[PDB]
Amino acid sequence: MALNLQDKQAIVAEVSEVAKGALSAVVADSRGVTVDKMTELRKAGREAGVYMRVVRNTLLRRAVEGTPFECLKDAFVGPTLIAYSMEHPGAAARLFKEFAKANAKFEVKAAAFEGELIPASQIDRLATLPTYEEAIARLMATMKEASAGKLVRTLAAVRDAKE
């Protein structure tokens, strides 16, 4: 390894991943396998890429004090063990899902998904931007408007009505 220089390197780099980054995912790893790297980086074969990195930098006073790059409310995002996930390129889309449906396979622990930056806030796992390039989902979000919402309710009765 090395000294405070190596530190500064690791931090300025990994938090540059939080400066120019597309998204952020904070995950506590206990019983974290090699099949984990063989999960996120296998999903990096045909879907993701080298555009993704997850380092365990929960070294904290390194990776936290190392955010003059302005990650706030993150002291609370520093408890216990955490594996930082940052995306420089691509959409912020799929990565959140990769972990979301990783940990539910029991896949280590999710830290209850403590939440991370670009909302810049606390813990809840939302559906915001898995759904893009899915815009067929919007093709069905129109719900046909005048037609399918009509064949749901305006024609509901004749099947549900005679009684």
Partner: peptide
């Protein structure tokens, strides 16, 4: 057409006809 016309018809339109109508309109699209 005025909404009240479509509503009046599709509401009344008998029964013996109507259940073979609106159901068929559920058998065309969706």
């Amino acid at each position: 057409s005025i909404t009240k016309d479509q509503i009046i018809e599709a509401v009344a339109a008998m029964s013996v006809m109507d259940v073979v109508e609106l159901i068929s309109a559920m058998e065309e699209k969706f």
